[PDB]
Design a protein around this ligand. Sequence first.
Ligand SMILES: CN(C)c1ccnc(N)c1
Ligand SMILES: [Cl-]
Ligand SMILES: [Cl-]
Ligand SMILES: [Cl-]
Ligand SMILES: [Zn+2]
Ligand SMILES: [Zn+2]
Length: 124
Amino acid sequence: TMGNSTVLSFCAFAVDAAKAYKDYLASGGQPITNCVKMLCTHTGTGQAITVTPEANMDQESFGGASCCLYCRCHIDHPNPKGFCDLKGKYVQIPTTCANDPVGFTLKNTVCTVCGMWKGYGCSC
Ligand SMILES: CN(C)c1ccnc(N)c1
Ligand SMILES: [Cl-]
Ligand SMILES: [Cl-]
Ligand SMILES: [Cl-]
Ligand SMILES: [Zn+2]
Ligand SMILES: [Zn+2]
């Protein structure tokens, strides 16, 4: 276990932070920990990114910024406006992927219709 500060530093100063973390995970690296887990009932809408925790029975809810590689690395978000989709919100992670919330949000996309994670919650 290399520690959160060692992993985040390695990714933060890489020319491509996302690729650095994905290559680290693929190599067998232990996921980033100390994401902020929310107390919830697991009776929510199950939507991906919400104003309040919305985990269903198949999900865990976390503080959004704690699960964002760019927020955790203190670097710019890689879009024109440098906007973060997660900061100030709550993110629902499938239980099967909740050992690595940072890797999950990095690798996945929210369906613009149902507002659930494409390939997991989404039933479109
Ligand atoms: C129903 N309960 C207690 C659940 C459901 C999903 N995930 C966790 N961690 C707990
Ligand atoms: Cl460390
Ligand atoms: Cl590099
Ligand atoms: Cl989902
Ligand atoms: Zn962020
Ligand atoms: Zn959908």
